[PDB]
């Protein structure tokens, strides 16, 4: 995020980091329950990648993080790699997340819910802060 600010630690408890086996953060995701993470299809997750829950500072060794293995990747069959439309994947975890003060689920909308233009929302992540 460019021109954002640091979050309060633990205040976005559904936010996860997807890391490859070298420890490199490549995408975010969100917990929707103890067993499932939603992310973008174009992130290209495999069962060799790791879901990291409960993290704030990726440079810290002292945080009580959960490193969760992925059982299966469910890429939405409507995903179109040419247009990047329908850009959603579900990850079924091999090991359930343990919910706590710093790890919990985001709500999903109903299909008919309305979010009007001009509404102020929030986005979070460990993406670049400057290009």
């Amino acid at each position: 995020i460019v021109n954002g600010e640091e979050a309060v630690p633990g205040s976005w408890p559904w936010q996860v980091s997807l890391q490859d086996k070298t420890g490199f953060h490549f995408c975010g995701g969100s917990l929707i329950n103890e067993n499932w993470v939603v992310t973008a299809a174009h992130c290209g997750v495999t069962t060799s990648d790791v879901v990291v829950a409960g993290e704030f500072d990726q440079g810290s060794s002292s945080e009580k993080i959960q490193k969760l293995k992925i059982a299966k990747v469910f890429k939405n069959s409507k995903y179109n790699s040419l247009t990047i439309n329908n850009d959603i994947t579900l990850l079924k975890l091999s090991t359930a997340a343990s919910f706590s003060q710093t790890v919990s689920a985001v709500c999903l909308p109903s299909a008919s819910d309305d979010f009007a233009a001009g509404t102020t929302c929030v986005t979070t992540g460990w993406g670049l802060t400057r290009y």
Binding site: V2, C27, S30, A40, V106, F115, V122, T123, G125, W126
Partner: protein
């Protein structure tokens, strides 16, 4: 890249207005947000765009794509969760 988790608040746009920036690249399963002095950027992909509804944070978008320079005057593009939630529910029910 930051070590520490970042946040930003930003407004939702309509798809019709987002098309002024991105043209025919914007599809019905996309939602735009930003152009407000902040931007999502590389490495944010897959993470949440949440809006508060009836006191609870609700997943409205999934960070998807946007400007190759993360311009803060151009809207970012997110997967529109309301268009995708029926598939989420079917997948969870079957697995």
């Amino acid at each position: 890249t930051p070590d520490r988790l970042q946040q930003a608040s930003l407004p939702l746009l309509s798809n019709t207005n987002c098309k002024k920036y991105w043209g025919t690249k914007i599809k019905d399963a996309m939602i735009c947000a930003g152009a407000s002095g902040v931007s999502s950027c590389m490495g944010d992909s897959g993470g949440p765009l949440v809006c508060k509804k009836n006191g609870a944070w609700t997943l409205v978008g999934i960070v998807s794509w946007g400007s190759s320079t993360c311009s803060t005057s151009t809207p970012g593009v997110y997967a529109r969760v309301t268009a995708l939630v029926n598939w989420v529910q079917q997948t969870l029910a079957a697995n």
